[PDB]
């Protein structure tokens, strides 16, 4: 109940919301059906439109008008945004030359440059080039300020998850808004685009920027506008708030536009009908900039122009139906469209079985346009598993397609021509970022980055300490002229042991054999030097990784590779080696096929054993440094040390052996040498964070050898590929992956073919940032380079996406 009999007189777009049953006058009151009876009359004036005309100049103030052109309008703060242009001979902001803003030029009483976030729905990255002729205000922000060629959204590429990630710096699995539609089984409640459940604060986790600001004494405008409030009124309201007295005036504001998304769904991303919505949003930007210029704030405020996601061509006929796969289609509930989420229709149905659903949906039709996954098996880069609102069964839908439960759902729920929501590496889903103002750089292009990084920068722009989030603070320092955040590298928690030769061969009873009984003082000193680290500068190019948790581990040096060997998990945490452009690939010699050799530096008690592998009929093993890339026949023996062995399913060994035998040398050829760091990851609770030992669900049978859930590799070279990886003077280039360690290749529909037809495609799907691997391992990489720490933070957030231009 609301007592709508109260009045909005002197309260229009009040900043503090009042509690029921008192009636409201704030920018969300319409959404709650709770505005005072006179809100439209007082707060949503429209008389005479949004623009001054010559005949209105110096008019007697009429309080009924939408905006004013009377002499007192600047002091009242309520002129139409074109007032000074029409009535005072001034230029529109867009017509002015750009001039570098070296320092804030702010009116007296301003304690900091305000921040205005201008967010646009469905603004695909390529609109900046393709719509350039019709968006002169946005093009001026872009060219004069700091811009990226695109910004990567989070998955799913829908509005609610992305706007709330922009506001929090958190992945959707952590902030809790994991779709536009959700069921929470603990609450037994459903969140939808339509209706009141979505207003309950229990869905919304993390700490969004407006709360961060308020808690730290920085006042905020309200960031939500009821959809029926026209954009012109939203802009005027922002400009009116910016005329409040200092102690009442917010320092951070947000505008959101439902366009161009609304028209893109109707017309497709590049429908001819899309020019007008792009022109209209540009005109709104121009209203804001003209208004700021009026207030003498156009060289004071930082403006961020940012999208939530892009838009792809999607039509009703490109729909896959689960009724063409499942015999049992009425026993499931599907969240449908550009992703699928499946759960049981009834929790009382004890016949429901996820394994049989997944099997029925796996590689059943030759050009199948979706792929099923249990959520823990999705690419780790999507960070889309650790939330009870994310169903265990997920369908990743191909770009341009939908999935639905039955055909009738498509015509009893063609209309639309555009949609979005697909994997966030898809080109059409990319969106936009421009920052303009005194704190951003001038005429600067920055590389693409992820929207999770922006919260920390918005906090930097406002002098706020960010709440804990998934950005890497400092990775976007290169966007900023000032207010940079200068982090220190984390301190190493565990220092390595450096074992020498401590055990005789007969102390080991591992059930291993090797044909290595072969025959020299010239070479003898050389072998000793290699084991004490003489080649370590060649193979450990950026310092040893730091271990940021408490554990026991040993550094082991070899001619061709260096490793950090865990005494707790019985295998390397990391193995580092460099492969030059000139390196040769060799075979594993016939007589060494099953060779595994005790490591006389590491106790039998802290070693794996071959008998466990023999007995475990499902599990085999592989090596982290590949025997194929040994520098000589003699050095190859080191590759078969028990301290270089890791548990591998046979199906996974197909993938791993092709990576090691074919792809590493391909990359060294293309990149002019590569440095490779590889290792295991354990994430049995799919939280994106390193497991402790007591979280491990699977061991090699009869042993305490834990089975990794994934294997990673970080592949680094010189950005200037005229310099070899091991003699690089300048910035680096990296690509990384986190491959799921699975007992089958059901993910790869073409896996019965030769590895040359499917393995690199799998690897591309499971591309990763170095930072993802850091979270999953508790390791910190790139400790000792010639590069600035912020540059290295940027490198650790890079994702190699494998999309065309």
Ligand X SMILES: *[C@@H]1O[C@H](CO)[C@@H](O[C@@H]2O[C@H](CO)[C@@H](O[C@@H]3O[C@H](CO[C@H]4O[C@H](CO)[C@@H](O)[C@H](O[C@H]5O[C@H](CO)[C@@H](O)[C@H](O)[C@@H]5O[C@H]5O[C@H](CO)[C@@H](O)[C@H](O)[C@@H]5O)[C@@H]4O)[C@@H](O)[C@H](O[C@H]4O[C@H](CO)[C@@H](O)[C@H](O)[C@@H]4O[C@H]4O[C@H](CO)[C@@H](O)[C@H](O)[C@@H]4O)[C@@H]3O)[C@H](O)[C@H]2NC(C)=O)[C@H](O)[C@H]1NC(C)=O
Ligand Y SMILES: Cn1c(=O)n(Cc2ccc(F)c(F)c2)c2cnc(Nc3ccc(C(=O)N4CCC(S(N)(=O)=O)CC4)cc3)nc21
Strands of 224-301 (E only): list them: 252-260
* Contact letters for Zn ion, residues 256-285 (x by CB under 5 A): -----x------------------------
**Binder among 50, 123, 241, 256 for ligand Y (CB under 6 A):** 256
Q: Was 298 annotated as part of a binding site?
A: no
Residue for token digits 């920085």?
218
**205 lies in the site for ligand X, by CB under 6 A:** yes
Within residues 86-125, the interface with ligand Y by CB under 6 A covers: 117, 119, 121
Taking the C-alpha atoms of residue 753 and residue 446, their distance in angstroms, rounded to an integer, is: 41
**689 lies in the site for Ca ion, by CB under 5 A:** yes
Nearest to 129 by CA among 2, 14, 29, 278: 278
**165 lies in the site for ligand X, by CB under 6 A:** no
**Binder among 13, 123, 164, 574 for ligand Y (CB under 6 A):** 164
Within residues 700-759, the interface with Na ion by CB under 5 A covers: 745, 748, 751
**392 lies in the site for ligand X, by CB under 6 A:** no
Instruction: Provide the angle, in degrees to the nearest 10, between the axes of the packed helices 159-168 and 454-461.
Output: 50
Within residues 371-410, the interface with Cl ion by CB under 5 A covers: none
Of the candidate spans 163-171, 363-371, 402-410, 641-649, the one that interacts with ligand Y by CB under 6 A turns out to be 163-171
Are 371 and 287 in contact, with CB atoms under 8 Å apart? Answer: no
Residue 248 in tokens: 């009442």
74-77 long-range Cβ contacts below 8 angstroms, 24+ apart: 74/294, 76/243, 77/239, 77/240, 77/242, 77/243, 77/295
**511 lies in the site for ligand X, by CB under 6 A:** no
Residue 255 in tokens: 């505008």
Of the candidate spans 165-173, 313-321, 555-563, 586-594, the one that interacts with ligand X by CB under 6 A turns out to be 165-173
Question: What's the closest the beta carbon of residue 428 comes to Zn ion, in angstroms?
Answer: 13
User: Which residues, 6+ apart, have CB-to-CB distance to 605 below 8 Å?
Assistant: none
∠ CA(564), CA(532), CA(534), 5° rounding? 100
**145 lies in the site for Cl ion, by CB under 5 A:** no
* Contact letters for Ca ion, residues 665-684 (x by CB under 5 A): ------------------x-
Closer residue to ligand X (CB): 250 or 688: 688
**262 lies in the site for ligand Y, by CB under 6 A:** yes
**192 lies in the site for ligand Y, by CB under 6 A:** no
**180 lies in the site for Cl ion, by CB under 5 A:** yes
Closer residue to Cl ion (CB): 157 or 790: 157
Compute how many other C-beta atoms are within 10 angstroms of the C-beta atom of residue 90.
16
Taking the C-alpha atoms of residue 583 and residue 579, their distance in angstroms, rounded to an integer, is: 6
Query: Site for Cl ion (CB under 5 A): how many residues?
Result: 3
Q: Was 330 annotated as part of a binding site?
A: no
Of the candidate spans 369-377, 641-649, 686-694, 788-796, the one that interacts with ligand X by CB under 6 A turns out to be 686-694
Q: In whole angstroms, how large is the CA radius of gyration of the chain?
A: 30
Residues in the chain: 805
Residue 261's binding partner among ligand X, K ion, Zn ion, none (Cβ under 5 to 8 angstroms by kind) is Zn ion
Residue for token digits 């341009």?
400
Nearest to 290 by CA among 81, 52, 438: 81
**30 lies in the site for ligand Y, by CB under 6 A:** no
Give the pairing of strands 674-681 and 710-718. antiparallel
> How far lies 265's CA from each of 38, 274, 340, 396, 414, in Å?
35, 10, 19, 20, 12
Question: What's the closest the beta carbon of residue 616 comes to K ion, in angstroms?
Answer: 5
User: Which residues, 6+ apart, have CB-to-CB distance to 739 below 8 Å?
Assistant: 652, 655, 656, 710, 711, 712, 762, 763, 766
Residue 81 in tokens: 């945004």
Residue 469's binding partner among K ion, Cl ion, ligand X, none (Cβ under 5 to 8 angstroms by kind) is ligand X
Residue numbers annotated as active site: 159
**172 lies in the site for Cl ion, by CB under 5 A:** no
Residue 613's binding partner among Cl ion, Ca ion, K ion, none (Cβ under 5 to 8 angstroms by kind) is K ion
Please name every residue paired with 116 in a beta bridge, in sequence order, or none if there are none.
253, 303
Give the pairing of strands 449-450 and 151-152. parallel
* Contact letters for ligand Y, residues 289-318 (x by CB under 6 A): -----------------x------------
∠ CA(469), CA(472), CA(473), 5° rounding? 90
Binding residues are 121, 159, 180, 261, 265, 308-309, 420, 683, 685, 687, 689, 691
Which residue ranges make up the site for Zn ion (CB under 5 A)? Answer: 261
Which residue ranges make up the site for ligand X (CB under 6 A)? Answer: 170-171, 173-176, 205-206, 383, 386-387, 468-470, 687-689, 775
Which residue ranges make up the site for K ion (CB under 5 A)? Answer: 613, 616, 620
């Amino acid at each position: 109940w609301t007592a709508t009999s109260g009045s909005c007189k002197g309260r229009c777009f009040e900043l503090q919301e009042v509690g029921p049953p008192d009636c409201r006058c704030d920018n969300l009151c319409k959404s709650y059906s709770s505005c005072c009876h006179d809100f439209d009359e007082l707060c949503l004036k429209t008389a005479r439109g949004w623009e001054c005309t010559k005949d209105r100049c110096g008019e007697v103030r009429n309080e009924e008008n939408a905006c004013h052109c009377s002499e007192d309008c600047l002091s009242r703060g309520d002129c139409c945004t074109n007032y000074q242009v029409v009535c005072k001979g001034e230029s529109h902001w867009v017509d002015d030359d750009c001039e570098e803003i070296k320092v804030p030029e702010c009116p007296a009483g301003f304690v900091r440059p305000p921040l205005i976030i201008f967010s646009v729905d469905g603004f695909r990255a390529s609109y900046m080039k393709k719509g350039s002729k019709v968006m002169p205000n946005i093009e001026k922000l872009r060219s004069c300020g700091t811009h990226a060629p695109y910004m990567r959204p989070v998955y799913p590429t829908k509005t609610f998850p992305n706007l709330y990630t922009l506001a929090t710096g958190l992945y959707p699995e952590s902030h809790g808004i994991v779709g536009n539609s959700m069921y929470d089984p603990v609450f037994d409640a459903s969140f939808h685009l339509r209706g009141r459940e979505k207003f309950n604060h229990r869905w919304w986790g993390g700490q969004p920027l407006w709360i961060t600001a308020t808690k730290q004494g920085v006042r905020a405008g309200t960031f939500f506008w009821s959809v029926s409030i026209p954009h012109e009124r939203r802009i005027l309201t922002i400009l009116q708030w910016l005329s409040l007295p200092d102690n009442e005036r917010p320092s951070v504001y947000a505008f959101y536009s439902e366009q161009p998304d609304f028209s893109g769904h109707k017309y497709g991303p590049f429908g001819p009908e899309m020019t007008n919505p792009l022109r209209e949003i540009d005109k709104t930007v121009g209203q804001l900039m003209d208004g700021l210029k009026q207030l003498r704030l156009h060289r004071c405020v930082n403006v961020i122009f940012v999208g939530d996601h892009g838009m792809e061509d999607v039509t009703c006929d490109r729909t896959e139906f689960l009724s063409n796969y499942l015999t049992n289609v009425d026993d499931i509930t599907l969240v449908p469209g550009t992703l699928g989420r499946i759960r049981a229709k009834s929790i009382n149905n004890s016949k429901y079985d996820p394994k049989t659903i997944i099997a029925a949906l796996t590689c059943k039709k030759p050009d199948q346009h979706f792929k099923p996954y249990m959520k823990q098996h999705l690419p780790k880069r999507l960070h889309y598993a650790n939330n009870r609102r994310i169903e265990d069964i997920h369908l990743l839908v191909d770009r341009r397609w939908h999935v639905a439960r039955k055909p009738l759902d498509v015509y009893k729920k063609c209309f639309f021509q555009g949609d979005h929501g697909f994997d966030n590496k898809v080109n059409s889903m990319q969106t936009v970022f421009v920052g303009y103002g005194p704190t951003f750089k001038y005429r600067t292009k920055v590389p693409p980055f992820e929207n999770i990084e922006l919260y920390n920068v918005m906090c930097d722009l406002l002098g706020l300490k960010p709440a804990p989030n998934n950005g890497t603070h400092g990775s976007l320092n290169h966007l900023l002229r000032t207010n940079t955040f200068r982090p220190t590298m984390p301190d190493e928690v565990s220092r390595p042991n450096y074992p020498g030769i401590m055990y005789l061969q007969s102390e080991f009873d591992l059930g291993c054999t090797c044909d290595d009984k072969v025959e020299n003082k010239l070479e003898e000193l050389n072998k000793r030097l290699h084991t004490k680290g003489s080649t370590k500068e060649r193979h450990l190019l950026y310092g040893r990784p730091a271990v940021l948790y408490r554990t026991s581990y040993d550094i082991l040096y070899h001619t061709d590779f260096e490793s950090g060997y865990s005494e707790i998990f019985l295998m390397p945490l990391w193995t580092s080696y460099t492969i030059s452009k000139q390196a040769e690939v060799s075979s594993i010699p016939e007589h060494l096929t099953n060779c595994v050799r005790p490591d006389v530096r590491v106790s039998p008690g802290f070693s794996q054993n071959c008998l466990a592998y023999k007995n475990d009929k499902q599990m085999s093993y592989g090596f982290l440094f590949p025997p194929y890339l040994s520098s000589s026949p003699e050095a190859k023996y080191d590759a078969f040390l028990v301290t270089n062995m890791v548990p591998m399913y046979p199906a996974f060994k197909r993938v791993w052996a092709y990576f090691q035998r074919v792809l590493v040398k391909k990359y060294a050829s293309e990149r002019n040498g590569v440095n490779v760091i590889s290792g295991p990851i354990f994430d049995y609770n799919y939280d994106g964070l390193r497991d402790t030992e007591d979280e491990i669900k699977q061991y090699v049978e009869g042993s305490s050898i834990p089975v990794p859930t994934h294997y990673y590799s970080i592949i680094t070279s010189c950005l200037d590929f005229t310099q070899p990886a091991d003699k690089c003077d300048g910035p680096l280039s990296v690509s990384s992956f986190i491959l799921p360690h699975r007992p089958d290749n059901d993910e790869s529909c073409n896996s019965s073919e030769d590895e040359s037809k499917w393995v690199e495609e799998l690897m591309k799907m499971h591309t990763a940032r170095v930072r993802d691997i850091e979270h999953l391992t508790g390791l910190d990489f790139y400790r000792k380079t010639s590069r600035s720490y912020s540059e290295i933070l940027t490198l650790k957030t890079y994702l190699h996406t494998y999309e065309s231009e």
